[PDB]
Each structure stands twice: as C-alpha cells, then as structure tokens.
Design a protein around this ligand. Structure first.
Ligand SMILES: COc1ncnc(OC)c1C(=O)Nc1nc(C(F)(F)F)c(-c2ccnc(C(C)(C)C#N)c2)s1
Ligand SMILES: COc1ncnc(OC)c1C(=O)Nc1nc(C(F)(F)F)c(-c2ccnc(C(C)(C)C#N)c2)s1
Ligand SMILES: COc1ncnc(OC)c1C(=O)Nc1nc(C(F)(F)F)c(-c2ccnc(C(C)(C)C#N)c2)s1
Lengths: 606, 213, 71, 75
C-alpha cells in the first residue's frame, strides 16, 4: 500500500524525492475527499500522521520534508485538520505535531508549524503525559508552553508567549497552569543546572500580573503552596524572597528593600499566603506535611524562620512553659496520690485535669507519619484515661485501681519527655521515638518469638517426665517458654541439672539460645544507638526544631480570634502605588556586595 | 521510542536468555571464580530477564518452597514435642520422613554437582545445600533409630527441628527486607560470634583451670 | 554489610531463579520464555525484550526509531 | 570599631587602616584617646578585633621614611 510507503519515506528521509513521487501518486489517486486523504495520511491504530512520524524521526533532511508535507496539505485545503491532528491512543492522547517538534528541540520547524496555524493550546491529555506517579510517564504540563519551559527551551518559550493566541493562564487536567508545572518538574540545585528557576522568573515577568501565582489547581494549591507541599526548597526560596527591580514589575516582588544605607539593609518580606492567617499557608504546609523529609531546609527559609522565631518569642514560649508547669504539677500531685494511697483534699485536682487532657488530646486525635508527630497525643490520652479509670475503680470497691494509678503516674513521668526534647539529655529518647517506633523493633520481636517458641519446644522435649517438682523447671512447654523469657530478661539461672536424658544437648541448646538472643539484642542496640554523633546531634537538633514549629502552630490554633489578632506578626506596609500588603521586616548587614542603592521604598533610613 | 526522559528500547536476547547451551545469563550467574557478579547482574538485559522470570514463575515457586519447608518444620516440631515418653501422629511422621528423603536427594544432587569456589564465601547460598541435607539426613536417621529400639533418636529429632528452624534463614534471605535483616544477623554470627567464641573459649578454659586448681 | 546485603540477596535470587527455571518442564519454559520476535533488518528477526526506562536526569535529544509511533 | 572578621569583610579594614596610617605618617592618630581613654590599639584589644590587633601589634614598614610607624623591626 501507499500509507506504509509514505510513512517509511518520511521516517527514513534518505531523500525527499521518494516522498515527492509518492505524494504525486497520492494526489493522482485522490483526483479520482478530505477524509479519504487524511485517513490514508494517518495511522488508524494511533492517529499519528505523516507529520508526527517525520518529526519523531529527525534526520538531516527533515525540514525540507515537513515543508513538502505542509505544502501538499495546503495545496489541498486540508492543512487545517492536518497540522492540528492529534493522537487517539489512550496512552498518548492529545499529542500533536507541535509537541513533537518542541520535544525534539527543533525550533525552526516549530516556528514553521506555529506560522502555518498549529493551535498552541493543544493539551497532551494522555495517560503518558499525566502519569499516576512520576517515573512512569512524562508530565511536563500538558501544553506546548509547559513543554518548551520544562525542556529548557527559552527561545521557544519566547516564541510561544509572543504569539497572540497563546493562553499563559491555561490549566491542564491536573489543574496546573505553567507555574504549577514548573514547580512540579523542578528538582534541585546542580542536578539539572536549575534552569526551572530561570523559566519561572521569565514566564512570571513576561506576563506581569498576579493571576498565574494566585491560581489554584484541582488540589486547591497555588504555585507557592505547591512548592510548599512538595520539597521544592529552591523554588520556594526563590518565590518567597523574590526581589524584582524593574520599575514596572516592582509590584511583582515578594521582598522589598526600603532601608539600605551602607552595609545595613532592612528588607520587607511578604506574608499574604505565608503567615497562617489563611486556609493553609506555606507555614502550615511546610510544618505539618510529613511526606518530603526536607523540612530541615524549608523551615530555615527567609520569612518562615523569623516568623517561627517571632511567634515563639512572642507567645509560644510562655504557653509552652505554662503547659509544662501545669503538667509537672499534675504529675507531682499524681505521684503524691500514688505514694500516700490508702493502704488529702486535692486528690480531685488530678481528675479534672486528666479529663481536660482526655478531651484535648482526644479532640486532637479526632481531627486526623501519625506515629512520629501525633505520638504524644496518644500517650497523653492514654495517661489521662488511666487516671480517670483509676479514680472510677477507686470510688468503686475495686482493689485493682492501684495498678492503673501507678501505671498512670509512671506514664505521666514518661510523657514528661514531650516537654524536654531539646535538652541534650533526653536526646536519645526523642530520637528513638522515631526510628524504634515502627520497623526496627517489630523484626526483633518476630525473630525473638520464633527463637522463644522453637527453643521452648526443643528444651521441653528433652526433659523426662519425673515423680512433682519434677527436678526440672523446664517441664511443660509453657514452663520452658517462661524460663527462656526470664533468661533474656536476666531473671533466670543456668543449671546443668534439669532431669534430662541428654544433659549435654540440653546445655548446648540453652547456651545457643543465650547467644542468639544476645546477637538479636546487639543488633537492636547498634540500631538504636547508630551513633555518628555529629549526625545524631543533627538529628536531635532537627527534631527539636521541627517539633518547636509544630507546637508553635498548635498553640496559635488554641488562642481565640482576638488574641490571634493581637499577636499577628507583620507590619502593614505600602510597597507600590496602592498595594498595602502585610510584611515582615528583617534587618541585615553585608560587607561584600557593594552596590549603589537604587531600589528602596523609603529614602530616609531608620 | 524515546520522547523525553522516557525511552523504550529493544535489547537482544539471542545468546542471553537461558534458552541455549550456556547463555550469558547462566554463565554470569553460575560462575563463582570472578567475584564481579554483583556488577554484571545489573546490566539491563540480564537484570530485566531475572526480574521477569521472578515475576512470571519464580516468585510463586519460591513461596511454595518456603511454605512446604515451613509446614515440614511445624510438623517436625509437633512430632518432637509430642514424642512418646499412632492415629494421626504416624501420618505426620510419614510426611516428615518422605519429605526428608525428598529434600535429602534434592540437596545431595545439588551437592554432587556443586563445584568448589562456590563455597569461597560463608555468606553464600551454596552453603545452605549442606545444612538442608544435614537436617534431612538427621530426620531420616531419627526415624530409622526410632523404628528400632534405640533411645538416641530424640537427640537427632531435636537437632533436626533446631536445624530446620535455623534453615528458615535461607528463605528469609529471599524476601527483600528480611534479606538485609537476615544477612546482617548471619554475618554477625558466622564471622564475629565465632571468632569471639574461639578466643572466649580460650579464656574460659584457661581461667577455669586456674580457678579450679 | 548495608550494601553487602543487597549483593548477597541479588546473587541468591539469581541462582534461585535459574534453578527454578531449570526445574520446569520444557513446555512450561516454552510457555514463559520472556522476549518477543522483532524484525530488525531485511531478514534479522531476533528475539528482543522491550525495556522502557525513564531516567529523570535526562539532558539530550533523541531522533531515532524502529516504530516511531509510541507503543 | 567597624572591623568584623575575615569571613564577613574579606579584610579591607586592615588595608584602609594601613593606607590612612601611612598617608598621614605620624603617631598622632595612634596615640589619640577617645572619650574612654582608649587608643586605637587599646580599643582593638577591648573589643576583640583580633585581625586588626594582629596587624597593629606586628606592623613592619620597610620604607625608609615611614619606618618609625613600625611596631616590629626585623633586623
Ligand atoms: C522520664 O522517664 C521517667 N522519669 C521518672 N519516672 C518514670 O516512671 C516512673 C519515667 C518513665 O519513663 N516511666 C515509664 N512508664 C511506662 C509505662 F509502660 F508504664 F507506660 C514506660 C514504658 C512504656 C512502653 N515501653 C517501655 C519499654 C520498651 C522501655 C519497656 N519495657 C516503657 S516508661
Ligand atoms: C530461627 O532460628 C531458630 N528459630 C526457632 N528454633 C530454633 O532452634 C530450636 C532456631 C535456631 O536457630 N536453632 C539452631 N540450631 C543450631 C544447630 F546447632 F543445631 F545447628 C544452631 C547453631 C549452629 C551453629 N552455631 C550456633 C551458635 C554459634 C549460636 C552457638 N553456640 C548455633 S541454632
Ligand atoms: C543469660 O542471660 C541472657 N541470655 C540471652 N540474652 C539476654 O539479654 C538479651 C540475657 C540477659 O541477661 N538479659 C538481661 N535483660 C535485663 C533487663 F534489662 F531486662 F533487666 C538484664 C539486667 C537485669 C538487672 N540489672 C541489669 C543492669 C543494671 C546490669 C543493666 N543493664 C541488667 S539482663
């Protein structure tokens, strides 16, 4: 047939004479109308046309070939639905020839196709271009502008934005516009040369306006909140501290120096969607999202760090010390009620406070990874439940209340860790609350149960029924399991006299058990110690900073509306003709970048 | 195929995919005179061939191997605990006996054609053929000594149960997480615990003679 | 031993896969037999295995093909 | 008073100190006491400007005329 011949002549490109003669033959067959021409000019299995197959296979003679193809399509008044054709397969649906021309870094042919009238809003709405998860498919933004900006082709991005029909505010299937897409594709500093920062700045300045940055995708996130959700520390550092000095695009900045005199410089940072006064700010998302493992570097950014420090030093230090004091006196009263138990009028101060915790942490659990952040919610709730249960059992005629009361006292003294985590002495607890939490200890427990059960059977089997202390504490299976457990708990004793027909085999298996349990214990030991003390101190400091931020936000959530408005970090500042956006002032001193100061809001510093 | 960061390539499998006399896969896997297999079993065609063989049949064959050994070990434990000190007990004992014979012939065949330089490293899979064979031999020997009027069948039975539960480490080295855990455990034991135990037995015997005299 | 674990797991895994593949009957092996025929040249027709690799650290351009239409 | 460190200033205050001290070649600048009685050297001692103090305490002018401004004389 002629379809395969045209496709081969257009993919191989060894000479355009083959495709010229084949197109002459095709026109001859057509003279004997548009649907037939393109049904024979496309591949019915995918919807691909000769133009896509020509651009998918770039060869030293492909520009002339696409020129020939477009000339033949325009000479038949079909170029409209031929240059705008798109795939039909489920995986690559929506992909057109301009996507392929840009993905092949062919700028000249791309300009050719845009001049010929290829619509520049073609959304590659396929399951390959909108992957369920990354690393299975290629998500760039489902648009020729997003594809030109994601593949680092600023020439084509200029060619696309200078066009007339381009939609810079176009939103793809995922709800993302160009800026969300740039945020998702951006990875790092020197991994791919950090061109996405350049493209972000260029696309935001070219369309100088706040609509691209205030647009929410289908998850209700803006490009800034989307950089906060993921761990895009570089794009977040750029957007947050973004200083444009062009006189017309100054209102696009998020940081405004107003003060510089010499090395001293007082800058303002913008706190609109950043300072926890809205639905979910960069602060909220950066602090509470436990899916990046990069909060160590994102909570030290320019406005966020000082915002956390200010909230702390303003009210969270006081609220935290007050709650620590209240829990400390709660625990002291609990200890004195547990010591002077009736084997004395304040025995109720505990109860009330218990119920308070019982509801507070209770509600705190009802509103929701969740064993590293919310652990203390569960332990405080369990402690309060134990206390109220001890009281209920004490006023009833139960003598089992002492167990719960002593357990509650002990668990409260253990919960005292939540308040002392950055104290360099409760460091190992505050760090093994995370590594030992889930997987490090359950493997040990499984292997230890296997050891215990197997060796219990092996040792109980070796023992002979005897006339009723039996001369053997390894009698039934339960007695051997108990002896072995007591052994790994240093509560036991090795006797070479256990009333066995094979005492040497019994001794061998007992010592084998001892040594194997010691190996398991040593594994868990070197696991939870894992010293590298520089790095473990990094880990403890990082955990303290993260929990400090988390509790700062928890404490800010507790205050009423009026107290929150009275704390309310951020001075109102005019930054443009009429902008008046709440900012946060940061004074700095730099003795290295000596420059004449031409960007400032106030000419008289102070 | 390549479009962006994606690329669908077509590798050739002519003398590679284990359908000839000795392919690159079988040679790369079975040759233990190089100590470079870790780097060669990561090349794209061999890597993906092993992955797909796993997914297609070898995951299931391995899980069935593990399940059969697990239930054989459980029945061995049950006949060791409930020993005589014949309705269904002897059914289970005949299960463990025929399965011990099967395991013994299998691992003995594997040992016969087990070339040296496989046993070069202690943390190597070749070593397991020996412990599986020893345990199956202990089981059949205990059944032989129990059919006769011997008392020492219980030592062999308990040793066989203990060695089977130890041999489950071969299967825990086949899962992925349990692989790292079990290899760490077995490294600790076979390398450091044995050296320390040699020098510590020296200490024990010396100071025992010293304090006893 | 952090990595030595992966080394030993990979070696035991490969050896297990190959001995299992040897245990099967010839018709079962013929049934599984990963890899599909592919025409490479005038008359080449070799058993090829298609591997799709996504490397997200890509900075280059590709222009070649055998069936340009993405599968 | 203005000198900070090397990681923050790259040591230009030492160079400006040398320049302004040589161009006005006389002990009137180094023997002057502020409203605390501190000379520039005692002031560099009081606030721990270790780089400025190291410069002043061992300052050797090899020029023949400005050698009386030296504090260390390699002979
Ligand atoms: C700063 O710590 C303290 N300071 C002064 N006094 C204290 O107790 C009187 C304490 C203290 O930690 N007490 C505790 N109580 C309990 C409870 F089980 F009862 F909940 C503790 C507990 C809970 C869960 N797993 C364990 C382990 C794994 C270690 C075991 N086995 C221990 S720990
Ligand atoms: C998952 O492990 C288990 N789960 C449940 N039950 C079990 O045993 C009842 C087991 C188990 O490990 N059993 C074992 N059997 C034996 C054998 F000596 F017989 F070979 C073991 C052995 C072999 C060589 N060197 C030692 C050391 C160095 C430690 C000494 N001394 C111990 S260990
Ligand atoms: C034959 O003994 C074993 N075989 C195999 N494995 C074993 O442990 C894994 C063991 C064993 O002795 N275990 C132990 N457990 C505990 C416990 F902490 F629970 F109390 C032990 C204990 C008891 C009392 N005073 C301490 C001091 C203060 C010295 C400390 N530290 C430790 S000792």
């Amino acid at each position: 047939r002629l379809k395969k011949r045209i496709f081969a002549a257009v993919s191989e490109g060894c000479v355009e004479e083959l495709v010229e003669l084949l197109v002459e033959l095709q026109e001859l067959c057509r003279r004997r109308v548009p649907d037939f021409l393109m049904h024979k000019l496309t591949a019915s299995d995918t919807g691909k046309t000769c133009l896509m197959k020509a651009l998918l296979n770039i060869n030293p003679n492909t520009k002339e070939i696409v020129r020939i193809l477009l000339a033949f399509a325009e000479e038949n008044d079909i170029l409209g639905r031929f240059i705008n054709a798109e795939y039909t397969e489920e995986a690559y649906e929506g992909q057109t020839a301009l996507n392929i021309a840009i993905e092949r870094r062919q700028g000249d042919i791309a300009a050719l196709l845009i001049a010929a009238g290829a619509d520049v809003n073609a959304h590659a709405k396929g399951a390959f271009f909108n992957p369920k998860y990354q690393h299975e498919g290629f998500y760039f933004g489902e648009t020729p502008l997003a594809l030109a900006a994601c593949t680092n082709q600023p020439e084509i991005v200029q060619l696309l934005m200078e066009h007339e029909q381009t939609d810079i505010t176009s939103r793809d299937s995922r709800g993302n516009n160009i800026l969300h897409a740039l945020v998702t594709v951006a990875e790092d500093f020197k991994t791919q040369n950090d061109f996405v920062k350049r493209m972000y700045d260029m696309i935001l300045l070219r369309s100088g306006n706040w609509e691209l940055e205030t647009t929410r995708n289908n998850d209700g996130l803006t490009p800034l909140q989307l950089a906060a959700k993921m761990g895009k520390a570089e794009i977040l550092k750029y957007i947050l501290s973004r200083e444009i000095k062009e006189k017309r695009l100054r209102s696009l900045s998020r940081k405004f120096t107003d003060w510089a005199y010499g090395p001293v410089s007082s800058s303002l940072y913008d706190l609109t969607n950043v300072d926890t006064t809205t639905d979910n700010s960069v602060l909220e998302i950066t602090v509470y999202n436990t899916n990046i493992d990069n909060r160590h570097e994102m909570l030290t950014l320019e406005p966020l760090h000082t915002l956390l420090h200010m909230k702390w030093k303003k009210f969270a230090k006081h609220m935290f010390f007050l709650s620590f004091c209240f829990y400390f006196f709660y625990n002291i009263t609990l200890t004195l009620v547990s010591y002077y138990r009736p084997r004395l009028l304040g025995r109720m101060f505990v109860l009330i406070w218990a119920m308070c915790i019982s509801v507070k942490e209770g509600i705190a659990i009802f509103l929701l990874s969740i064993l590293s952040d919310a652990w203390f919610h569960f332990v405080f709730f369990i402690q309060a439940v134990l206390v109220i249960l001890s009281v209920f059992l004490y006023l009833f005629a139960y003598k089992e209340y002492l167990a719960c009361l002593v357990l509650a006292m002990a668990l409260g003294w253990a919960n005292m860790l939540y308040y002392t985590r950055g104290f360099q002495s409760m460091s190992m607890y505050s760090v093994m609350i995370q590594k030992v939490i889930l997987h490090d200890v359950l493997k040990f427990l499984f292997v230890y149960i296997v050891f215990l059960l197997g060796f219990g059977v092996a040792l109980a089997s070796l023992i002979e029924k005897c006339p009723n202390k039996d001369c053997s504490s390894y009698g039934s299976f339960s007695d051997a399991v108990l002896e072995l457990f007591k052994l790994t708990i240093g509560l036991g004793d090795l006797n070479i006299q256990q009333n066995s027909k094979y005492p040497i085999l019994f001794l061998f298996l007992l010592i084998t058990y001892v040594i194997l349990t010691f190996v398991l214990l040593l594994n868990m030991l070197i696991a939870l110690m894992g010293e590298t003390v520089e790095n473990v101190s990094k880990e403890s400091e990082r955990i303290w900073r993260l929990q400090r931020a988390r509790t700062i936000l928890e404490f800010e959530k507790m205050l009423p509306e009026w107290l929150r408005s009275r704390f309310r970090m951020g001075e109102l500042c005019k930054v443009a003709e009429d902008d008046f956006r709440l900012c946060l002032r940061i004074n700095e001193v730099k003795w290295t970048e000596w420059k004449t100061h031409v960007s400032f809001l106030n000419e008289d510093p102070g | 195929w390549a479009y962006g960061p994606v690329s669908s390539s077509l590798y050739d499998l002519t003398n590679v995919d284990t359908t000839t006399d000795n392919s690159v896969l079988e040679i790369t896997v079975y040759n233990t005179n190089i100590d470079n297999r870790h780097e060669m079993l990561t090349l794209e065609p061999l890597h993906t061939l092993l992955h797909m063989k796993w997914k297609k049949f070898a995951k299931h064959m391995f899980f069935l191997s593990f399940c059969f050994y697990f239930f054989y070990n459980i029945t061995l434990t049950l006949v060791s605990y409930y020993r005589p000190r014949g309705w269904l007990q002897l059914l289970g004992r005949m299960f463990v006996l025929i399965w011990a014979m099967c395991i013994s012939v299998k691992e003995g065949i594997a040992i016969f054609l087990l070339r040296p330089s496989d046993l070069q490293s202690i943390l190597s899979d070749a070593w397991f053929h020996f412990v599986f064979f020893i345990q199956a031999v202990l089981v059949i020997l205990s059944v032989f000594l129990y059919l006769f009027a011997y008392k020492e069948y219980l030592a062999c039975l308990v040793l066989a149960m203990a060695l089977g539960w130890a041999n489950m480490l071969y299967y825990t080295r086949g899962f992925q997480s349990m692989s790292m855990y079990s290899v760490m455990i077995q490294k600790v034991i076979l390398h450091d615990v044995l050296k320390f135990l040699f020098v510590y037995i020296v200490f024990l015997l010396g100071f025992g003679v010293a304090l006893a005299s």
